Structure 1
Amino acid sequence: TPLGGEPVFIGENYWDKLTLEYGSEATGTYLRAAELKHGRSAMLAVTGFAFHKLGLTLNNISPHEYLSIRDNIKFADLAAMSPIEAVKHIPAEGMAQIFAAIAAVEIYELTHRNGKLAYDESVAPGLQPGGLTGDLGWNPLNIKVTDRRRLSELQNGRAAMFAISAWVAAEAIPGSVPI
């Protein structure tokens, strides 16, 4: 009773073992939510990696290449030391900042149920059965929310995930296929 699966072929398999025997319908939602989160994350990661490999960084695309602004961290040096060895050169301040935005988003996905935050509750809205559906409601200039869009998004998600995993593996060690 889940959403559309593989377009060429379909297979649910490992789904009725937890959404009927182990868990229930509430677990179904949760699983889908997790999947969507991961998918989106993978997509963004993929794009970032692609950009880094290509060369479109601050030095190439804009007038500013000095990220550290005190730690002498230029974009040229970070674009010459690959993608995996560049994330470790990010200044602590910046890391802290990034963690902040993500934290805020996660908290929102946790407190603000529907339109506004809920002041009195035993637990957070998203910590209850079916707490997080997957959709945050963030639809700026929303073009459409149909039954095709969702499926497309999901597909792009898994694909992105696989792609980035493979990319990381190859940078690290002999993969298998070409890039």
Structure 2
Amino acid sequence: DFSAAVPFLKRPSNLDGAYIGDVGFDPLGFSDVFDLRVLREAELKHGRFAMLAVLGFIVQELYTFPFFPKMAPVDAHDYFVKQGGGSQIIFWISFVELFGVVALFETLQGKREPGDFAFDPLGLAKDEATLERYRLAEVKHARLAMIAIGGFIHQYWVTKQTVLEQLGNF
């Protein structure tokens, strides 16, 4: 059959709706070679980091903590490389990513969904149907935010104005 997204491209054949958010889009054929659990692991991880980054880029413009000096987020990266806070964040992410390595091994061995860490403290996933719609929304937001974060950082480079101030000006 044909891909739902691209009508004239054939369906990849490793993508038969097994993973939510599948629209049959995979022209370069990475699912014909590589494991889709690993690729969905990577898609959801990149997407969650990007979603947090876009929220951070905007909120950091709106507010910053009193103990830290006020500055733009790219300058924040460089300041906290030299200050020590960046190493703390890198270390704690690396610490969590150790048990993430264990989690990815559990996914490869079949006993875990690729983005599932059982992280539902506030019980928002009331029912299975609600979870399916929520994870479709998570996939769509994750992809959209990857595009968005690239835009903010690259535009900041080209025009040295922050995202809220760039919308505010021009």
Matches within 5 A, 1:60-79: 65-66=66-67, 75=68, 77=69, 79=70
Tell me if 1:139 matches 2:152.
no
| 33, 41, 64: which one aligns with 1:57 | 64
- Structure 1 partner of 2:85: 94
CA change 1:152–1:97 in 2 (3 A) is same
Q: Counterparts of 2:86 and 2:26 in 1: how far apart (Å)? A: 40
- Structure 1 partner of 2:105: 125
Tell me if 1:82 matches 2:72.
yes
Query: 3-state DSSP class of the match of 1:47?
Result: helix
The answer (yes or no) to whether the contact 1:39–1:160 under 8 Å persists in 2 is yes
**TM-score (normalised: structure 2):** 0.68
What value does the CA root-mean-square deviation take over the aligned residues? Answer: 2.9
5+ residue gaps, structure 2, are 1-15, 160-165
CA shift, 1:139, in A, is 2.1
**TM-score (normalised: structure 1):** 0.65
5+ residue gaps, structure 1, are 59-64, 67-74, 114-123
The 4+ residue runs of structure 1 with deviation greater than 4 A are: 126-132
CA shift, 1:159, in A, is 1.1
The answer (yes or no) to whether the contact 1:5–1:11 under 8 Å persists in 2 is no
Counterpart amino acid of 1:12?
A: F
What is the total number of aligned residue pairs between the two structures? 140
CA change 1:143–1:93 in 2 (3 A) is same
| Higher alpha-carbon Rg | 1
More helix by share: 2
Q: Counterparts of 1:141 and 1:43 in 2: how far apart (Å)? A: 19
| 149, 156, 159: which one aligns with 2:134 | 149
CA change 1:154–1:168 in 2 (3 A) is same
- Structure 1 partner of 2:98: 107
Q: Counterparts of 1:166 and 1:18 in 2: how far apart (Å)? A: 25
Counterpart amino acid of 2:101?
A: L
Q: Counterparts of 1:173 and 1:95 in 2: how far apart (Å)? A: 25
Counterpart amino acid of 1:142?
A: G
CA change 1:151–1:132 in 2 (3 A) is closer
